[PDB]
Amino acid sequence: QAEVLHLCRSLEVGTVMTLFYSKKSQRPERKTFQVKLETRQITWSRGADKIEGSIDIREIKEIRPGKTSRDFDRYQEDPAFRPDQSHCFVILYGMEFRLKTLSLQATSEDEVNMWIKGLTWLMEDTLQAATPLQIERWLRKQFYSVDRNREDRISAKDLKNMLSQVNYRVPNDITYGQFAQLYRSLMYSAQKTMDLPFLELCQVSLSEFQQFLLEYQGELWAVDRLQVQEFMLSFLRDPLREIEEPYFFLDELVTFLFSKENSVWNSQLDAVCPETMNNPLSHYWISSSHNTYLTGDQFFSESSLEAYARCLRMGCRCIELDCWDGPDGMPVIYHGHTLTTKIKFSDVLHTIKEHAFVASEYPVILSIEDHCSIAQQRNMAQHFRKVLGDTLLTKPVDIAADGLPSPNQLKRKILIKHKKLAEGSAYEEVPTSVMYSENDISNSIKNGILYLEDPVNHEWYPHYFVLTSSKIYYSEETSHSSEKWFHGKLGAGRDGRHIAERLLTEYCIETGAPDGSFLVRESETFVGDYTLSFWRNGKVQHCRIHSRQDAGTPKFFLTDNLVFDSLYDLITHYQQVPLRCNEFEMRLSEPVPQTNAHESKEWYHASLTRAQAEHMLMRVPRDGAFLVRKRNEPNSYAISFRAEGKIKHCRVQQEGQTVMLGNSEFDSLVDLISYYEKHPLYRKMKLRYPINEEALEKIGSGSTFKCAVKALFDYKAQREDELTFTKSAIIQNVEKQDGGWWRGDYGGKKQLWFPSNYVEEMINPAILEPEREHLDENSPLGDLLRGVLDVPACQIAIRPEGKNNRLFVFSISMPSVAQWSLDVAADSQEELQDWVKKIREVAQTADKKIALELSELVVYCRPVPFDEEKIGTERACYRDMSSFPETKAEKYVNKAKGKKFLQYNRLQLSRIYPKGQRLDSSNYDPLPMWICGSQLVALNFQTPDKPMQMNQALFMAGGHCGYVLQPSTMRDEAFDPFDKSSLRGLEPCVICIEVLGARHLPKNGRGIVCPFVEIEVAGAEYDSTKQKTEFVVDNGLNPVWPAKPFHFQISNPEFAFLRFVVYEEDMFSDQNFLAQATFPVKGLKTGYRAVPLKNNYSEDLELASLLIKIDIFPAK
């Protein structure tokens, strides 16, 4: 303790260290770093006084000594930026799979050691701070993000804009102390509705609270008043009011109801139970990762050492290595036949050794998919033995055993899963006869990234292409005049003067602007000069700013006043010292902002009906085409856009200085549209193509290969190199150039020139969207599939001169569809020749040695071909294992075969992994595999979908040690996941839940969420069901919900999960994930329980929680 109070102050003051930037463009610079300790943040900026970056300490995952980060590795050949590893350390922090990294370099060794021990103590202390102190640091954090820290107070409009940033909409000056009391009074006021039968500020005593924990919460220990007293003081952590008998204010009780100290999840179950770790390994569910090296999708994402660290530190116990021959005798790890980056086998092994047992004592299994040559396999084996040492399992635990060893017997051991040689042989036995080629990226002629021209904006975008022996699958696309005070020309006469006075008047009255607030415009009367307007005593004042180009140098001046070299210098001067105009003395104060910059934008039409907008946008064959139209009522607009081949509209309202869309508020139409070019507005669609007349006239015209054009007029050749033709003639093989002249073939003459405005280009059908209602759902691209080409019906030609700034282009055409063609670009000449050659070959078709040194390391986890007939017999070997891609496993976890699979899994390991078509790294449902006793159910840990949320829920029992004992009831001969009658007299469970409110729900975009909660039980099919509440309007900070009691009945509570998902109902009646919590049903507490909420990666959201009334029968 005393050491910690001395250590915090040290880092409070801070240090200077150079910072290696994750962005590729940026190069290392120095800043200065400190810990606020009242917000528990790390801050840094330029010099000793500013703020330029921040890190929440509650988000820190790992503080890592050394220079091991990709930020450091970017400059590791640059002699200027090759530091010494002792001088460095890395903070890995965040709430997604890919952590953020602060990669810092301090000179002394002991600055690093102090920071590591400092941040480490704070890291733990912040994570376990009791809820009032966490709420305290949150309020501090919101306050220090506005005009506070300078005048110590904040505006009532700066307070409005802050509450909307934390999901609260006020229907219509203060310091931090009044700010906190405001928040406290607001949360209690908003949710005083809740049924809460056990219930201004009133006081509840030590007696009252103890009575609560016993009659309503089932906390039997609370018959001891002293424990209840130590509980309340453990909540408040107020040193004051501790000598006196503890109490809760009435709003303090409601905050306790929402807090993690009141979680429905019994934290006693976060501990490992060693008593349950004595069955054979086959009896356990084992946390398992698929292609662990990958950070994103299966085709182009980066392989990272950090993913092994992250997965291991999430409690995963089975990880995967795809090993290929590497450049220097040492294997690289990457996903074969794809563009995922390569990492080295030695760096992977040191990462595994480093992090294997940080999160758990229990054994790690390395599943190795091996394509290496024998020699490099041999270096693998030598490296395993040398680096892992006695960590490596290298001989059986028990040579007389008839079952796998227990997790306890394998603690701190790492096991190797690899093909094992037949004893005395040099090939592995391969009794696997599946020439059903899977049709994935593993079994294809060529895979790669190629570029397709957008027909609306004519940019090139990347797409995943896969050529099989019959088809090509291509995917969806992958991965002074600027001055606020210068309003330019507002009109030609009195209208311009009236426009300035309206802008200035409205801005001043609406915002309570100060005197001196001003704008500048081009003079309506004195050509070349400007007029200045500023507010003084509720009246507008106008002043001429003269402009003279005598002596060839710009001279600007107000009448009878000083001379300046630019408009900007004049305005900047008079913002500091007063001007004298209309005989007043005034200083120039606030620039009035322009509210009408949308008027000159491509996407804006002052006069457009809804039908006209639909007609324009239906001509754009891509989603995300859009415009804004003014409407017939004042202060009213609409956005019109294309999504899924349909047209949508939504109203935009101007209210003074802001604009409103749904409940999302913006400064202006321009800032609105600018926001939805960067963030999605409908589903995943951003606004991409602004439609006006010019954009419509330019759609599709990228055609280059045997293009026909229709003659609009008769043309008689005025020269010998010129084409003669009649109106409506079809001119073929047209070479298109700018300058108004094209080349083409007509009436016997070849490649003769004609005026390009005398013809229209024939539509290229390839520019239209492919009909996706009958696309193969299981092509090698999975759900990323956009279009299929039937290769023998195509032909391909290189265009040597390239196209449109792409140098390497070929053209896919179909002889039997005139005018159809795709220009397809590659990144290199070699990549171009390889595609053309392999595609043409496909068109003209109408039709494993293993190194002993490595085989020796496979003790258990020995892959064999799956032998269904060996199950239940003396032939079955507990050391052998088999593997099932998702679709094969689906054939053994159904009503017919599931019991057989359960019998296999009691003795032997089975591994499940996703189907290769899931190129998007999505995940299959793990529960059907688990409920038949499969142990190694490999999911993509990088993907934040429901299967990974179930995985982390399941392994939450045991604190993510990664091994959960399967319940004995389902290692019974009788158990049948598709027949609840085999459960015999296993007692069921009835859960009744009322969702009372929520606090601190996260935002999804700029608006205010309208949240509902879906409550789900997941388990056997006979137990799985969903229910949901209504949604409430415009409140994510403290909503409450109508009375709507839910009932669930669970015949098998030993395999059942309770799941809460908070969704928003958005402005389009779409449902969007906001937060979730999933729990095994066995560890549920009853009464009025908080549901602490997590994000889609299962990482704890700050303060976000539900309050529920949950009652479970039969009573404990």
Residue numbers in the entry: 19 to 190, 207 to 233, 245 to 524, 545 to 768, 791 to 934, 947 to 1215
What does the paper behind this entry write?
Phospholipase C gamma (PLCγ) enzymes have long been recognized as key components in intracellular signal transmission, linking activation of several types of cell-surface receptors, such as receptors tyrosine kinases (RTKs) and immune cell receptors, to downstream processes triggered by the PLC-generated second messengers, diacylglycerol (DAG) and inositol(1,4,5)trisphosphate (IP3). Mutated variants of the two PLCγ enzymes, PLCγ1 and PLCγ2, have been linked to specific cancers (including T-cell lymphoma and angiosarcoma), resistance to cancer treatment (e.g. CCL resistance to ibrutinib), complex, dominantly inherited immune disorders (originally designated as PLAID and APLAID) and inflammation as well as with protection in Alzheimer’s and related neurodegenerative diseases; the major, comprehensive discoveries are described in. The current model for activation of PLCγ isozymes, following cell stimulation, outlines a shift of equilibria from an autoinhibited, inactive enzyme towards an active form, resulting from a large-scale conformational change and characterised by a release of autoinhibition and exposure of the membrane interaction surfaces. The area in PLCγ1 highlighted as a likely nucleotide binding site, using HDX-MS and additional experimental approaches, overlaps with one of the two autoinhibitory interfaces, an interface formed by interactions between the TIM barrel in the PLC-core and the sPH domain from the regulatory (γSA) region.
To further understand possible mechanistic differences resulting in activation of the PLCγ1S345F variant, we obtained a crystal structure for PLCγ1S345F and performed atomistic molecular dynamics (MD) simulations for membrane lipid interactions. The major difference appears on the accessible area near the mutation which is decreased for the PLCγ1S345F variant, while in parallel the hydrophobicity of the surface is increased. The mutation is located at the rim of the active site opening of the TIM barrel, involved in interactions with the membrane lipids, including its substrate. This feature, also known as a hydrophobic ridge, is substantially enhanced by the S345F mutation. In an inactive form of the PLCγ1wt residue S345 plays a key role in autoinhibition. In PLCγ1S345F, the interaction between S345 and Y509 is lost. However, the aromatic ring of F345 interacts with the side chain of I494 in the sPH domain via a CH-π bond. Similarly, within the sPH/TIM interface of the PLCγ1S345F variant, there are other changes that could result in a loss or in a formation of new interactions between the residues in the TIM barrel and the sPH domain. Based on the experimental data suggesting the higher exposure of membrane interacting surfaces in the PLCγ1S345F variant, it seems that an overall effect is weakening of the sPH/TIM autoinhibitory interface. Uniquely, an increase in PLC activity for the PLCγ1S345F variant was also observed in the assay where substrate is hydrolysed in solution.
